[PDB]
Design a protein around this ligand. Structure first.
Ligand code: ANP
Ligand code: ANP
Ligand code: CA
Ligand code: CA
Lengths: 580, 605
């Protein structure tokens, strides 16, 4: 059935013809100035980053060949003339620099600058540009672009282009040291002559730019990149502020993890666990690089189960996509994710020690995420790492108290859980008579776990009544699957269930078959009464039977909402109080 | 107050010079190889699209015959990936011009207007081969003139050599000498994965290593009336990656505000409760792109194509998020209409759908800002009614249209089931009015109606709420029982006084109500729904008693004859009333109090 036409049949005949690749410049502009980014607004991000680079370069040159203005990014909107303007007080550009850097696509003076630095210099980690195309994103939104630039040298210039394959350059007077870029906005892009709009964009992408940013004379970016500062020299109130900002929330972080590492990768990061539990009516961690936003929802840096974390991750040597809203597929990113997952797990274990009470609450609220982690990830090594966070009750421990899976195993022991709705049902299991996982998805969780600690874990799964016994089976027909006697004290009866699967598959139903078994205490003065009132008062006996049964179901946690019984109970009480 | 440096002070001195834009060619090639596509694998998509273009160009010119296929071959030994197409090929000046020049697209200049089949556009996809390859060889036969075959060759150095060659078949063959880095693309299973993912709907047949791949019809682009039930079942299973079938299918086409070609399926399966806690493919020109639906419509599976969405150069991003919000709103409106239509066509089937997917409506209502969208979604909700018989579902619309002209509100009552609603103490009270009352039985119905607030400018008010408001109006309500069967005002006063002492710190108020019949008492709270919700993490509760009720009269009698029993009874009545109110905490602690009440009451029996 095979059909392949591919065959080694070709032979070159003759020689020569060496050619150089070329570039259709006019179309390449158009690509850059249109087809690169998801949203037009990104041109602000690009021009501010460029201005930041011009300031960073000035700062760096003055370390050594020191000189004397303030280092600032200024924005101005003109809604009437329909312009947007940005000015920096940076190194500026001479004529040669404008023709070269602005007039050549893919040429990056800032990349050249970066390559020539001592790799330890502070400018090494803060210069943003590398691709040599960002500036052309202005033509995304503008028919005319004007650049006024004064070098920090021994003549000011104006660079001008409509974005159609040509530009002009003339000498300019009255040009302040640095660079002024004026965009004559297109009709459909006039929203960028709106102050509120430009403000939105600056704070979205450029809020943590090193240098101060002014819009129409007013400072904006008062927030500092906490993730780049020394952990122990940050306050509790600053995290509170920063968390809220980056999480877009209004509560506190209940956990803060400030993780810096130069080690497997450059990592400057902060992670928060919200104080508030998430629920039925609901951002993630954001990815930055050199203080500039890449993704508000970082996709490939953390596992999926860790998405309950808010915060920030910034690497400076992470390979960026040309759009600067994506990462390139890389072994570094698959490692960073492995590193962050292990670091966050170690952090949460440390918290289960520092404050086991507090961790308990955190596992109530977010423990569903670990459970998901175990069921999803393929790596068996990792499944047992996440399983270190799980908490349950034990057969041997008391109620309301939990333990980790790593609580030893006590001699030969080489494998012991019963997933049940609640305590009372578990302690009365047939298969318990040989761990207590009361939470939902606990079964499915350990069923995917399969092993922990190389160890194992498998689903541990007088005669005066008789008439009464036989009578109740005639009243509660197809409600229970059996009725028996029991030696119970304060309770007239109790409800026990055999298969724990049958109890789950029943609470999800909002008769229902689960083969429930009702055990009766013939030492109770209610059962004693029931026996008598059987023949003495059949209609009162019926009411009292259904109550005792209902009561036992409630006490077993198999009747959470007793609304159905209230009318009938009221009737039993009046009948029962007829006497008094 | 202000600090602004920008001033209109720059003036041009003297003449200027004109310049042309230039390009750093080697660095642009670097960018395409290393920084343009976020995933290496899409070099396969780009080469296949390029080959598909060469075939459409041949077909077009073949309206002046030959076979028209795409061949992939993977040499694991030699570390080689090959693609051959039988299309229009290219001559020497075509090789030199189109392959040698970045951002040059033959498949663009070609567009003599009439097709919508051509994919090429940007002029860079071919160079995506250098993501994964040290060396690329191209063999191309122009198939036009007395034109020779040619071999184009490049190591990715910014240089390429061209010689004329023999035994070059009609079309183009591209050989990638893969990098040790990416030898996965000489794996047949791996290369198949990539074709299935991006190029599964390509027009022409694609063979991998001699086996024809199971490419599909792009169903969403076709005439809705020509697609059989069974064709939808198959496509559903493909796009959802499912093993069941659709219960609803919406094939939606529009040119109107936006170009839309889409298919939406609602699975026959109930959504997994685990998957809800933890959806639709987006295409252009038969090639896959990667929210578009509102989050509450994430239960839909299916596909969306729109020619108005512009692609980015990487072909993985969309380019006007105002366009997407517009598209999202249009689809949401259409899906709502569609489901309303299905409610009318088959109400029985829609009950099943509502029962299995209702939670998504409720979510969408609770999480929307815009009231109009809340009310749009709320059209999908179904309830029972005090007007209609048991079992019969209704909507807010049918409630609205039943409303007498003067009536200003929509009354509801939330209970577990019909029987409890019908015999609810809160409904007994509403029955004294002649207003219709909606009956809502799902867990989060009340929460949904609190967030909904109003519908068609009519306020949503619970029975329980409206019962409290009627206190601060004229009672006006007369007891169901005559004065003969009730406690005298003097015995009632005495009983309240005693009850106030026995429940001191548990109730704000105790008072009699004439608005009950069957029940001894009830708990009222103005904001009952809100209270009920908050309890799903004391109050200011009011207990209202029925002095015609036998249990209450007996309570009044017991407080003097058997005070301990009287207090025990009162505790259970208040407990009972809190349960009926849906305000009870753990009911288990009471079971002990109840058993010791029951024994002591049944003690003279
Ligand atoms: N405001 C400015 N002041 C001084 N020089 C500038 C300014 N803006 C741009 N330049 C120079 O022009 C070059 C080209 O900028 P651009 O074309 O945006 O590429 P890039 O910003 O360097 N890299 P990217 O932003 O990643 O595309 C920069 O590298 C600078 O050397
Ligand atoms: N297999 C082929 N057969 C014939 N012509 C081809 C083939 N592959 C490429 N070409 C020609 O070379 C041109 C350049 O291709 P390429 O550089 O990939 O740009 P593109 O395919 O037009 N657009 P995109 O894929 O969106 O970058 C195409 O537009 C065709 O004219
Ligand atoms: Ca440039
Ligand atoms: Ca090209």
């Amino acid at each position: 059935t095979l059909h392949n036409i591919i065959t080694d049949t070709e032979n070159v005949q003759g020689s020569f013809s060496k050619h150089e690749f070329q570039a259709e410049t006019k179309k390449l502009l158009d690509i850059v100035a249109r087809s690169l980014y998801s949203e037009k607004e990104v041109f602000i991000r690009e021009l501010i980053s460029n201005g930041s680079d011009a300031l960073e370069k000035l700062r760096h040159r003055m370390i050594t060949a020191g000189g004397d203005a303030p280092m600032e990014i200024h924005l101005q909107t003109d809604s009437v003339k329909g312009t947007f303007t940005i000015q920096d007080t940076g190194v500026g550009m001479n004529k040669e620099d404008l023709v070269s850097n602005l007039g050549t696509i893919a040429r990056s003076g800032s990349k050249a600058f970066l390559d020539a630095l001592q790799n330890q210099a502070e400018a090494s980690s803060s210069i943003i540009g590398q691709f040599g195309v960002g500036f052309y994103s202005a033509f995304m939104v503008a028919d005319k672009v004007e650049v006024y630039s004064q070098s920090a040298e021994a003549p000011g210039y104006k660079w001008s282009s409509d974005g159609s394959g040509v530009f002009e350059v003339a000498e300019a007077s009255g040009v302040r040291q640095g660079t002024k870029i004026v965009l004559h906005l297109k009709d459909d892009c006039k929203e960028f002559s709106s102050e509120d709009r430009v403000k939105e964009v600056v704070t979205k992408y450029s809020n943590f730019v090193s240098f101060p940013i002014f819009l129409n004379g007013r400072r904006l970016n008062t927030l500092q990149a906490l993730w780049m500062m020394e952990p122990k020299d940050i306050s509790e109130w600053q995290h509170e502020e920063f968390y809220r900002y980056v999480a877009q929330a209004y509560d506190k972080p209940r956990y803060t993890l400030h993780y810096r590492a130069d080690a497997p990768l450059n990592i400057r990061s902060i992670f928060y666990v919200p104080e508030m539990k998430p629920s039925m009516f609901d951002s993630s961690v954001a990815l930055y690089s050199r203080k500039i936003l890449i993704q508000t929802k970082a996709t490939d840096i953390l596992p999926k189960w860790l998405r309950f974390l808010r915060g920030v991750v910034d690497s400076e040597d992470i390979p960026l996509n040309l759009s600067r809203e994506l990462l390139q597929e890389s072994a570094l990113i698959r490692k960073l994710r492995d590193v962050l997952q292990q670091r966050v797990i170690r952090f949460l274990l440390d918290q289960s020690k520092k404050d086991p009470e507090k961790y308990a609450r955190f596992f109530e609220d977010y423990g569903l995420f670990m459970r998901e982690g175990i069921v999803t990830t393929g790596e068996q090594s990792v499944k047992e790492d996440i399983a270190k966070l799980l908490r349950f009750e034990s057969s041997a421990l008391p109620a309301g108290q939990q333990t980790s899976l790593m609580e030893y195993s006590s001699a030969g022991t080489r494998n012991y859980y019963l997933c049940a709705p609640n305590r009372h049902l578990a302690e009365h299991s047939p298969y318990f008579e040989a761990l207590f996982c009361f939470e939902q998805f606990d079964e499915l969780t350990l069923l995917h776990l399969r092993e922990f600690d190389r160890k194992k874990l498998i689903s541990a799964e007088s005669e005066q009544a008789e008439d009464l016994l036989a009578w109740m089976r005639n009243a509660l027909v197809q409600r229970v699957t059996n009725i028996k006697v029991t030696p119970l004290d304060t309770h007239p009866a109790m409800i026990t269930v055999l298969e724990m699967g049958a109890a789950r598959h029943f609470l999800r139903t909002q008769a229902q078959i689960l083969q429930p078994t009702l055990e009766i205490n013939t030492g109770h003065d209610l059962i004693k009464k029931l026996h008598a009132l059987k023949d003495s008062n059949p209609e009162l006996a019926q009411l009292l039977l259904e109550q005792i049964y209902d009561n036992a179901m409630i006490a077993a946690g198999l009747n959470e909402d007793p609304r159905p019984m209230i009318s009938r109970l009221n009737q039993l009480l009046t009948r029962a109080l007829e006497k008094h």
